[PDB]
């Protein structure tokens, strides 16, 4: 199937701190595999999945020294943005970046990414053409014009089409699954009128999933209640969805679970 690499980077200023904190987290197929954190006693990129310890010392030294460079890049950029928005001293400020590549199931490049947010809102992104930039704010046009003038997008296009794909292939080989949800229905005597049925899905991976209750053939948002999918903490995720249905008409309500590891969706009813 398809594959991806992403690094999610954060630079954070707060009114007390001397200089910002820089954190870089790399993902392969949406699973964290390296992490740099300037707050560590000896800041360095570190493996976060056992299959990455295959990389020898000079990989880590090289990547660590790059991260110290990006840390200074973020420091200057945060200082510049402060002025672009006429923000005074004494606040908390955040720069965030996501970058990486998506690969088809043929392992060829689908799309490259390079996006930034300031204060948690879109600041500037490289367009899918990998040649032009989009920037919403009037303040961000200053950055776009700087980056257009220096031809910066050319280096980024080269990364996204070259090293990003090439190193993702290396990683895919060195770390060369899914867990289907287990579902059950719980019964919750609620009021005189009716009961709630709670359709649980447990132990699944990845987190993308969908639960639906149908009264004998009709999906309903009629006060169907759910929770956001949540990590169990062991690598797998959880979700439930609940609905109220008159007593004695329980097995007229039936829950469906959609997850990509399933041979087909699960249909299930309440079981005493």
């Amino acid at each position: 199937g398809p594959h991806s690499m992403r690094y999610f980077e954060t630079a954070v200023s707060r009114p007390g701190l001397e200089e910002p904190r820089y954190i870089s987290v790399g993902y392969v197929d949406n699973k964290e595999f390296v992490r740099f954190d300037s707050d560590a006693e000896n800041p360095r990129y570190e493996p976060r999945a056992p299959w990455m310890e295959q990389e020898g010392p000079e990989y880590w030294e090289r990547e660590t020294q790059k991260a110290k460079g990006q840390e200074q890049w973020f420091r200057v950029s945060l200082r510049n943005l402060l002025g672009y928005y006429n923000q005074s001293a004494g606040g908390s400020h955040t720069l965030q970046q996501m970058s990486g590549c998506d690969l088809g199931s043929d392992w060829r490049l689908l799309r490259g990414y390079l996006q930034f947010a300031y204060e948690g809102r879109d600041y500037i992104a490289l367009n899918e053409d990998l040649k032009t930039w989009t920037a919403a704010d009037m303040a961000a046009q200053i950055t776009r014009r700087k980056w257009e003038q220096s031809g910066a997008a050319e280096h980024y296009k080269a990364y996204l089409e070259g090293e990003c794909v090439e190193w993702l292939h290396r990683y895919l080989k060195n770390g060369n699954r899914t867990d289907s949800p287990k579902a059950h229905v719980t019964h919750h005597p609620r009021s005189k009128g009716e009961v709630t049925l709670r359709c649980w899905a447990l132990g699944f991976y990845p987190a993308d999933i969908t639960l639906t209750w149908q009264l004998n053939g009709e999906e309903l948002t009629q006060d169907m209640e759910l929770v956001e999918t949540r990590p169990a903490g062991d690598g797998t995720f959880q979700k439930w969805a609940s609905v109220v249905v008159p007593l004695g008409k329980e097995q007229n309500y039936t829950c469906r679970v959609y997850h990509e590891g399933l041979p087909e969706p699960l249909t299930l009813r309440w079981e005493p």
Partner: protein, 99 residues
């Protein structure tokens, strides 16, 4: 703009009274990333609480998982209390073994 944290409190495994388990406090959708999270048993700070490393999702919002060992009983109350700059008061979510 400040985004107010959303909180779930739930067990790793189906809860069984008297059976050791793992209690999660999952905190999402907040900004900026600085945040203080506490887990309580009957209003007392639970001493050994593990804290995931800060991460953010593709919509730019931060998320963090706190967890700790616990053995549920019929009578004990468990809670997660979150302080964050988007909120004038700390927000507490109480564990509900049915959710």
């Amino acid at each position: 703009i400040q985004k107010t944290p959303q909180i779930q409190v739930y067990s790793r495994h189906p809860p069984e009274n008297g059976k050791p388990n793992i209690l999660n406090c999952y905190v999402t959708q907040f900004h900026p990333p600085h945040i203080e999270i506490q887990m309580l048993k009957n209003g007392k700070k639970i001493p050994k609480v593990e804290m995931s490393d800060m991460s953010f999702s593709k919509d730019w919002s931060f998320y963090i998982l706190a967890h700790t060992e616990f053995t549920p009983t019929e009578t004990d109350t468990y809670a997660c209390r979150v302080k964050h700059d988007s909120m004038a008061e700390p927000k507490t979510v109480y564990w509900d073994r049915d959710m």
